[PDB]
């Protein structure tokens, strides 16, 4: 299964609001915004991946699994 | 801890060789390449994150944890 779509889009969602929240620095954000739109086009994902969105955003899972393995 | 750096860079590594392998389509790859360099600048990560790289690349963990939760 193409979990990589969900990977991209879930990151898109988190980075979207992270951008709004101003988590990164200005230039970082701006570049990050480009990254988002590139990731969308890269994995060929869309907001249709929101229809099949997972209960929690994957970045959250990453903060658990990737930080503790 | 900034696991988000490791997130970005580990994805950078996988996407780097995925780009080379031609996993995505041409335009997707090209856009994905831009995404990589943007993610690098976004999270403010570098190849120094390779020095602190995790045993396995995080995309692998994602194929486990994100696909099965």
From Swiss-Prot, chains A, B:
It comes from the Eukaryota. It is found in: Cytoplasm; Nucleus. Ubiquitous. Co-chaperone that binds misfolded and hydrophobic patches-containing client proteins in the cytosol. Mediates their targeting to the endoplasmic reticulum but also regulates their sorting to the proteasome when targeting fails. Functions in tail-anchored/type II transmembrane proteins membrane insertion constituting with ASNA1 and the BAG6 complex a targeting module. Functions upstream of the BAG6 complex and ASNA1, binding more rapidly the transmembrane domain of newly synthesized proteins. The second tetratricopeptide repeat (TPR 2) mediates the interaction with SARS-CoV accessory protein 7a. Belongs to the SGT family. Homodimer. Homooligomer. Interacts with DNAJC5 and DNAJC5B. Interacts (via TPR repeats) with HSP90AA1. Interacts (via Gln-rich region) with SLC2A1. Interacts with HSP90AB1. Interacts (via TPR repeats) with HSPA8/Hsc70; the interaction is direct. Interacts with BAG6 (via ubiquitin-like domain); interaction prevents interaction between BAG6 and RNF126. Forms a multiprotein complex, at least composed of DNAJB12, DNAJB14, HSPA8/Hsc70 and SGTA; interaction with DNAJB14 and HSPA8/Hsc70 is direct. (Microbial infection) Interacts with Vpu and Gag from HIV-1. This is Small glutamine-rich tetratricopeptide repeat-containing protein alpha. The lineage of its organism: Eukaryota, Metazoa, Chordata, Craniata, Vertebrata.
């Amino acid at each position: 299964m193409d979990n990589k779509k969900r990977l991209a889009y879930a990151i898109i969602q988190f980075l979207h609001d992270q951008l709004r929240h101003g988590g990164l620095s200005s230039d970082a954000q701006e570049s990050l915004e480009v990254a988002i739109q590139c990731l969308e086009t890269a994995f060929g994902v869309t907001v249709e991946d929101s229809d099949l969105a997972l209960p929690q955003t994957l970045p959250e899972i990453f903060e658990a699994a990737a930080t503790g393995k």
